[PDB]
């Protein structure tokens, strides 16, 4: 019994018990269609009300290794966001997701997803993972805010 999988099952159980509304966090379907992959989760983050990202839903994967809760998961936005701290790969750059910075083993999935949501509204000037939104954020905020708002519309759930 892996200690990673033991922890992940608890996280999922707790998540179902209580989680923020509008968020989603599930095991991903395995490509062969046979059951779910506990080591790769598919998540959704709603734009925070009142922020630039409001109205959007942002799909993100969390991939865990057998080293987890010791090592953080890797979080990647499925479609890349126009944001200073999201790499062109979609990968989230966030101190609590860095084992050499603020990652600690007790941190929950809920805490990660809320942390990332907060990041969306509050970019961090020292870890710029994407050059142009970082540039615009610093020097032409009005233009940044219009591009972000436009994108938020693009990520509105289908209807």
Q: What is the CATH number of the domain that holds 136?
A: 3.10.110.10
Q: How many Cα atoms within 13 Å fall on the side-chain side of residue 85? A: 19
Rounded to the nearest 5 degrees, what angle is found at the Cα of 134, between the Cα atoms of 132 and 136? 70
Which of the 8 DSSP states describes residue 39?
E
Beta-carbon contacts of 114 under 8 Å, excluding residues fewer than 6 positions away, are 20
Q: What is the largest CA-CA distance in the chain?
A: 52
134-142, long-range: CB within 8 Å, 24+ apart, which pairs? Answer: 134/84, 137/84
What token pair was written down for 109?
Answer: 């999935």
Point out which residues pair with 43 in neighbouring strands. 25, 60
Active site residues: 93
Contact (CB, 8 A) for 97 and 3 = no
Q: What is the resolution of this structure in A?
A: 1.9
Residue 153: other Cβ atoms inside 10 A: 9
Q: How many domains does the chain have?
A: 1
What token pair was written down for 143?
Answer: 């233009």
Beta-carbon contacts of 53 under 8 Å, excluding residues fewer than 6 positions away, are 47, 120, 121, 148, 152, 155
Beta-carbon contacts of 27 under 8 Å, excluding residues fewer than 6 positions away, are 12, 36, 37, 38, 40, 41, 42
Domain range for 26:
1-159
């Amino acid at each position: 019994m892996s200690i990673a999988k033991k922890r992940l099952a608890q996280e999922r159980a707790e998540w179902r018990k209580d989680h923020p509304a509008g968020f989603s966090a599930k095991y991903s379907p395995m490509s062969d269609g046979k059951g779910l992959d506990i080591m790769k989760w598919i998540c959704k983050i709603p734009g925070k009300k009142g922020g630039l990202w409001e109205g959007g839903e942002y799909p993100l994967t969390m991939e865990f290794t057998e080293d987890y809760p010791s090592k953080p998961p890797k979080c990647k936005f499925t479609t890349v966001l126009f944001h200073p701290n999201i790499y062109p790969s979609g990968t989230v750059c966030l101190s609590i997701l860095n084992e050499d910075e603020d990652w600690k083993p007790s941190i929950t999935i809920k805490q990660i997803l809320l942390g990332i949501q907060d990041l969306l509204d509050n970019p961090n000037p020292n870890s710029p993972a994407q050059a142009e939104p970082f540039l615009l954020y610093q020097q032409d905020r009005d233009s940044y805010e219009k591009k972000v708002k436009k994108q938020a519309i693009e990520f509105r759930p289908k209807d």
